[PDB]
Amino acid sequence: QDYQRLHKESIEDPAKFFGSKATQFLNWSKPFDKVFIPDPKTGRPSFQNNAWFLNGQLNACYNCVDRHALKTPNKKAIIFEGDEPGQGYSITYKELLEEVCQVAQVLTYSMGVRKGDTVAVYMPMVPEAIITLLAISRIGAIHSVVFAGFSSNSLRDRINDGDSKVVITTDESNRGGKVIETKRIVDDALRETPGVRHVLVYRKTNNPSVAFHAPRDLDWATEKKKYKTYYPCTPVDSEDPLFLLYTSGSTGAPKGVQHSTAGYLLGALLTMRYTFDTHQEDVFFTAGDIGWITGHTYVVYGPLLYGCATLVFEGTPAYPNYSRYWDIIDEHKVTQFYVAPTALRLLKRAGDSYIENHSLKSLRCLGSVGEPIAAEVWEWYSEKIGKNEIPIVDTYWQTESGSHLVTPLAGGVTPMKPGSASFPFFGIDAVVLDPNTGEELNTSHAEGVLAVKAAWPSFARTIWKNHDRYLDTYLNPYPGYYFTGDGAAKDKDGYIWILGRVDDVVNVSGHRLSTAEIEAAIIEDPIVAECAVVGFNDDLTGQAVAAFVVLKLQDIKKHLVFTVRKDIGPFAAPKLIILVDDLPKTRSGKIMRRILRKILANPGIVRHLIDSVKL
Amino acid sequence: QDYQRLHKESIEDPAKFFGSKATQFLNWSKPFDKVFIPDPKTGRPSFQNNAWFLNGQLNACYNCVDRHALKTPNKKAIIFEGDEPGQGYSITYKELLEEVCQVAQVLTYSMGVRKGDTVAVYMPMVPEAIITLLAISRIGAIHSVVFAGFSSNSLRDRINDGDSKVVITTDESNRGGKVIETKRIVDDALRETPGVRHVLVYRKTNNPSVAFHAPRDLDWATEKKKYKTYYPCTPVDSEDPLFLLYTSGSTGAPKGVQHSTAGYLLGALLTMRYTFDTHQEDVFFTAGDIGWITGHTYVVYGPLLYGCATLVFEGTPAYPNYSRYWDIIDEHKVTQFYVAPTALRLLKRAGDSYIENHSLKSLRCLGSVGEPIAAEVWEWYSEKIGKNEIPIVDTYWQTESGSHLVTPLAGGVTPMKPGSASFPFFGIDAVVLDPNTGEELNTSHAEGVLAVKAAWPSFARTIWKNHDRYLDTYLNPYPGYYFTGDGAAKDKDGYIWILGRVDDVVNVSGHRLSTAEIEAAIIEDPIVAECAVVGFNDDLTGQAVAAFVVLKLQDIKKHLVFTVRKDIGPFAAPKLIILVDDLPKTRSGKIMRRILRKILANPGIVRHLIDSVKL
Amino acid sequence: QDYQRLHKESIEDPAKFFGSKATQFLNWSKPFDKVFIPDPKTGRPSFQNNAWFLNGQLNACYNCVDRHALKTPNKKAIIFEGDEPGQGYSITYKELLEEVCQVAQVLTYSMGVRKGDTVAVYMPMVPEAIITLLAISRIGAIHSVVFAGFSSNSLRDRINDGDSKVVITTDESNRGGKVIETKRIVDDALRETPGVRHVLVYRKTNNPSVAFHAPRDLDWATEKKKYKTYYPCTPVDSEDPLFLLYTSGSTGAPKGVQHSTAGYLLGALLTMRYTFDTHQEDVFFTAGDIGWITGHTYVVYGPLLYGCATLVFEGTPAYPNYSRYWDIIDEHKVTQFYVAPTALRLLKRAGDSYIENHSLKSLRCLGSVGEPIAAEVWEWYSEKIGKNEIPIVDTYWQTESGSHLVTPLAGGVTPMKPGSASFPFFGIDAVVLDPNTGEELNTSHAEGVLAVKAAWPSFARTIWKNHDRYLDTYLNPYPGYYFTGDGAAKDKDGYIWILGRVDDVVNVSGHRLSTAEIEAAIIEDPIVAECAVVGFNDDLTGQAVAAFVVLKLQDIKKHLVFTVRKDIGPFAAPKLIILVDDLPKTRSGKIMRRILRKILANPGIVRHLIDSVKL
Numbered sequence A, B, C: 001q002d003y004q005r006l007h008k009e010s011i012e013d014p015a016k017f018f019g020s021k022a023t024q025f026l027n028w029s030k031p032f033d034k035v036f037i038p039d040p041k042t043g044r045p046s047f048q049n050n051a052w053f054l055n056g057q058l059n060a061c062y063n064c065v066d067r068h069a070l071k072t073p074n075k076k077a078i079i080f081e082g083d084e085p086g087q088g089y090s091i092t093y094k095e096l097l098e099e100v101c102q103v104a105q106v107l108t109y110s111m112g113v114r115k116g117d118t119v120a121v122y123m124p125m126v127p128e129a130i131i132t133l134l135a136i137s138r139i140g141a142i143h144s145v146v147f148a149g150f151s152s153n154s155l156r157d158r159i160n161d162g163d164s165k166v167v168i169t170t171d172e173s174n175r176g177g178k179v180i181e182t183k184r185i186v187d188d189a190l191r192e193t194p195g196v197r198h199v200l201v202y203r204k205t206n207n208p209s210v211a212f213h214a215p216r217d218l219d220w221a222t223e224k225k226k227y228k229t230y231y232p233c234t235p236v237d238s239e240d241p242l243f244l245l246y247t248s249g250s251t252g253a254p255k256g257v258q259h260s261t262a263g264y265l266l267g268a269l270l271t272m273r274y275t276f277d278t279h280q281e282d283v284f285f286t287a288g289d290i291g292w293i294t295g296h297t298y299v300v301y302g303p304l305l306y307g308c309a310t311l312v313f314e315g316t317p318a319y320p321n322y323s324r325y326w327d328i329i330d331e332h333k334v335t336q337f338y339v340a341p342t343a344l345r346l347l348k349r350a351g352d353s354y355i356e357n358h359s360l361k362s363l364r365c366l367g368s369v370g371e372p373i374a375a376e377v378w379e380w381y382s383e384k385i386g387k388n389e390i391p392i393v394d395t396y397w398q399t400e401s402g403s404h405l406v407t408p409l410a411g412g413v414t415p416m417k418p419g420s421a422s423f424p425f426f427g428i429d430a431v432v433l434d435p436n437t438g439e440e441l442n443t444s445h446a447e448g449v450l451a452v453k454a455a456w457p458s459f460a461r462t463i464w465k466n467h468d469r470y471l472d473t474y475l476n477p478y479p480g481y482y483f484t485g486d487g488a489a490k491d492k493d494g495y496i497w498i499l500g501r502v503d504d505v506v507n508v509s510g511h512r513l514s515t516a517e518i519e520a521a522i523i524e525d526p527i528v529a530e531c532a533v534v535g536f537n538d539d540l541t542g543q544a545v546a547a548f549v550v551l552k553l554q555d556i557k558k559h560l561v562f563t564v565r566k567d568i569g570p571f572a573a574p575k576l577i578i579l580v581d582d583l584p585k586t587r588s589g590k591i592m593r594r595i596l597r598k599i600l601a602n603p604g605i606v607r608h609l610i611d612s613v614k615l
């Protein structure tokens, strides 16, 4: 009965629900006055003026490190695993404290950072990346992480929009067995970033005469050794920005999504205890770069705020072989695996031969995030990896949500449906609206746009320097609710099914076809292992269905077409399928269908996709 | 007591014994009148006019497919395993039915084949080879299979003697990791086959501009897709030829051994139930090409007639490594392994390191066929592979016998002797005759020529187009009996020991030395792993013993000589041993000693053997 | 209570203790009159005139082979393992007898060796090396083994000093996967050995036109085949030399340490039964070349005298991979592993990944010999290899001691201390003396020079041809006792700790710093895996501490320095650490610190060490 009460308590009485959790899970410097700013029009937390734990003061880094060093100093906080097998090591909580303290002082004294500044972070998945981020919040600064792979052009714009006067990177990065010049990329970018005063560089490889030029550049080791190991934290208000995270999804100048401190931290805590049923002696492993909210909230914040161990792997699922991912899971007794479908799709390709010897009884929970997960792949995940006896939480949420939106509970929710994300998390009032006829709440089993009626604490507060794009994008499209950008439907039993962003929905003769269903049914064919249905500027017929299929010399298309009508319908069967080797994806994993749309196709994926359509 | 009765019932009262089994195991279109044509001179089935189930009508393909598709449509019929590991797949009985039906129609409508025509088959061990053969009998045609390795010169003669107006092959064949141009070989051959009207080609690799020329050549896929999936069978008389199989053993124009339909099919059924104790849920694996009776009767007919699953592996025991044979046995839970000694001789060389991890508790029976099996190799087979707790049937029989001649019963016969084939199968009256003084039946423990007193149903009926060679070869050498061509002896306890074809017996001073005993004792020495004793045009001394030994710089011969006298005798010890790297063998496995005789040595084996004798 | 009595019995009443064991463990031809020659000055066995089992007659080879062939002829004596995996084989005791008998006759009749001659042996670890040695004692000859790796210059001098008129070698030696020209090395050496009459060569590889020239050179196989398989032994007096073993340690013309027959043989027997608790059905594996006493006493004499099986491996611990050492231990069910720390140091580097699958429950005892063994390496040895449930005897002894000096008993001694060798063996009266103020016996817990008060039977009797060096080296430095050359100390509980040869002790301001403690503490750091502290001609300060550290770009030295003071003291922390890739070691394993001293650095190790000091 837990979920039924706890969720209603969080919806009709958030003050009591979150007020209590807020004092429970976090250590405060100054108690908060009010829990949230309501919507006077008789309502829950206001969307326009969303704000939680008013006048309250606390410190992220203090909650992620200090309190645990002063309790379980000898317990491990970070468990690292290099790109190469035996190159790992752990960092106790006591030592992380020391490290984050020398770095906090490096920032204040060597670089001149103050409370409120934007610190840009361009690093790979190594411990120093993590302590860097904690060092930034320890001093009341706001970190802005950029994927350690993005072009120097991407780096520049993000720093310029971010107001970042300083930067933090490495000299090079060995990924999946491939070195990557980051310091190089940093310099090309700084040829156009006027406000960059300093650049802290953590030599990871011992560079091949990599640039380093004046008092601008500083050495991580050189500077660290200068400061004591303990440094006092900087209290900040509950509603002061914790960080910024430039989301790089759709077209249009990247958005600097801004998150609160308390509110965001409480969500990461609530989701750890309920969603993953995390304890203190756990070993959480989130296979996602610090480049996206996944890595922010589940490979750094959630785990460290809770006080358990979080695993940092700077490598790839295929390096040095597909058994690698599972080799590091059984030696570290990882109790929490959390990865994206793309990865779970490539591992399922290599064959359960690499999973053979692995007993991996160390796991207790599995999780999926990033995009829809087909049923056969969910089953495969549930049986091969999970040895079918351990939960699987397919977590629905966004960079803006901060934390899980709708997800199954590792324990609270007894049942589970392979393509569903089960139920809305606590505080989230998920409803399905009619995309056409206003913001009408669809009650009976039906498909429509997903939204939340009231705001919650972990909800992003704005978009860096322009609260206008924020409103138009998230609150103006469907006045009164929050616009997720995705389509969904609740089955007879209430479960929620994510249809895959109704922005890529192909409307054939007024039918609106969501991608989730059509593509999953495709990939779920021995002939394929990945599918992507899109569209293009179409005059007549309204809009046709074209599928870019990728196999694992004739009439091979027709089959995949007659199978679409076999279970989905004849008005869903594509008018043309294109055979491609792969699909244009983001470092995150998501498939860029807007690229398949825009034009029928600049990475190598482009050209090959520029030809696989002409003929 | 089973064997004692059942065998006597089948000898003194075959009418009742086989008449009953005949109605039990096979589905008939029109009941047979008489069981067999006796020998009026008071006797069992006549040899000269051998004929069973008179006036009866049935259909092979119907008995191998239909009846089982209409009972257990979802059960697997063929389990394939490509030359490369994970390239396998299964064919249910329902689907095999569909396939064999489209192909039957391809033969009738696209190629013009009629009931009675000879269809030549030149294919590798792939499913299509199997459905092709079934397609041929479904329409009352007679299939003539030729080894997918034989020269184009071999192909031509076999087709010309066979009267084959059509052919069936692939474009190329990847064997043991080596592609083989078959379509090439087919074309060189058809430059001399005047009566070849059509050629059906199943593109297996997607050829590198392989020939295909006029309405003569037809595509398997192109043609198949044209016909419905169900096609009616063609009833044929019990005594109408099922197939022809050109035996390529001794010198002299290859013989087109012709087998009946009913009679041959009943033998394959009797031998499955008793010899292998096969059920319905079994997975039978016969490691022998469709090129010889072994593959006809135990990798196609026996298994499919019984209704279980038969495994089709188109690869080699050494590819991609010696563990391969056992890798496919444990995943498919093969319950019946049946292979030849040559293979069991090369696997025993690699060391029980490849058999280590393998539990292979899926097996229930082991079998040996092809040639004599030494004791140490039988033991090795019995202990390493069999984990000594599962039977081993060393099956004695020929292309002419159709089915097992003398063999141990997987259950019926409680004891077993490593170099013996135990007892004569039901219906077979095996006796040992004196090679010199007439057809005298030797009763007491002694060695002599093997023969059968009366005929049985699975006995070949003739030799294509010349019943004269048939008589001289099989029935005239020892009037009244059937001349096996081998030597044997029954021990005190009755077991029968095959001496290895008394046609290669070296008679030293009137002693007649069979090869079985002398060679087994040789190979059974750590210094060797294969031996071949023969002879040559010898004037004085009568005939000497020369052994071509192959190891796994002096006085190394003498040893192997003093060891021959140690257990066999000083008049058996060879006068000269030749050290060769290997021996001239047939695609079947048998060692060609008549080549070592003929001349002291055209494949590479020739030249090297042309020198290893001069010096 | 066993050890307490047995040891006191052997000290205050050796006549009864050893007299009884002497008749028990050895078969005599003529009983011995007196047990030992005492020191008239009221004492135990005299040092100056040490002699045991007077007037007694026996035969080594008879005690190592014969008696066991005439009891358990079918039991295995030698279990060989080539450098390449599956190239092994065993030699029963019956066959070893035959072999040692044909070789004894080869020596007498083909080469002219007589009782008393010195036979030089230059061979690798192959059976023939072992039978050669036994063949030599069988005829009353004295064998002088030289490492199959030493230069031809080393071979010459050892033969010249040895008086060796004959030699025994192979043509080449495949070691660790590297062929080694020995016959080559033998010939260069014999260009200066005037008294060499013959050279017996056992062709191991079948040479690439390797030299062999006149009646001087003889073939092992050619000669062996000439003699019967049984040949009578030659009785020799208890005190007649068994062998000579040129120790190649410190500087100065190599010493030909001469051992008795009976006395040495009894020690090897006593040490097997008590130290290793050996039985008859055991499989002893001593990983040490026949080049040093270890191989003499524990890979030949001890095992063969006892009547069990001894394993002969002619390969390297790293070939063909680090799992090799353990691969041969589980297949042969080795019950006794005995190796040197250098090896145990390189195997511990590869990671317990090669030890994973290995169950190796066949072991019953582990042993360490050669040099001090750090605690972490002892633990690693005790837990990974021993699966912590099997004893570990860190055996202290020298080439001169013949057999164990102070060691733990596989069973008799219940406790064990990782860096201790426990207690003095029976007959050995170990005491700690003051290096400065005379031969004062230190009683209370303190550090000093190790010595033995009375002699024992296995004690070397002299140094070939110059009993003068013998006295000055072993009995004159500390009159009355035996000078081991090492430093030690007994802890509160009596255990003895070897400090590492007080000849390499760095005396900083009158402190005398033994290497054992300082280096073990160093290597016991994740940053290193091998350490070597030495010194050099130092005027002021007295003598500084310089450590040559080898890792598994600044302030890396300081750490290892602050750690030295952390547990040992600030007056032990080195004044300078040198970073080298490896250390100059002897084929035995011992680290040559006198080379690091002599000069701050001819094998490749020299040059690199000649530079790693200048800068």
Ligand SMILES: Nc1ncnc2c1ncn2[C@@H]1O[C@H](COP(=O)(O)O)[C@@H](O)[C@H]1O
Pocket: A247, A292, A293, A294, A368, A369, A370, A371, A372, A373, A394, A395, A396, A397, A398, A399, A400, A421, A484, A485, A486, A498, A500, A501, A588
């Ligand atoms: N568990 C999930 N199932 C289906 N879609 C998901 C899931 N998690 C995230 N998404 C989609 O991915 C987007 C979030 O991307 P991002 O902001 O980069 O984390 C949303 O718009 C969702 O539609």
Ligand SMILES: Nc1ncnc2c1ncn2[C@@H]1O[C@H](COP(=O)(O)O)[C@@H](O)[C@H]1O
Pocket: B247, B292, B293, B294, B368, B369, B370, B371, B372, B373, B394, B395, B396, B397, B398, B399, B400, B421, B484, B485, B486, B498, B500, B501, B588
């Ligand atoms: N199990 C067996 N033991 C000994 N010889 C056999 C065995 N099976 C077949 N043969 C021999 O192989 C010949 C049959 O060859 P084939 O007609 O090609 O099957 C016969 O002449 C037999 O002598």
Ligand SMILES: Nc1ncnc2c1ncn2[C@@H]1O[C@H](COP(=O)(O)O)[C@@H](O)[C@H]1O
Pocket: C247, C292, C293, C294, C368, C369, C370, C371, C372, C373, C394, C395, C396, C397, C398, C399, C400, C421, C484, C485, C486, C498, C500, C501, C588
């Ligand atoms: N178990 C041991 N522990 C410490 N040092 C040892 C040990 N065994 C032998 N040694 C040293 O090695 C030397 C003997 O070398 P060797 O004569 O070649 O066997 C002695 O001087 C000892 O100091």
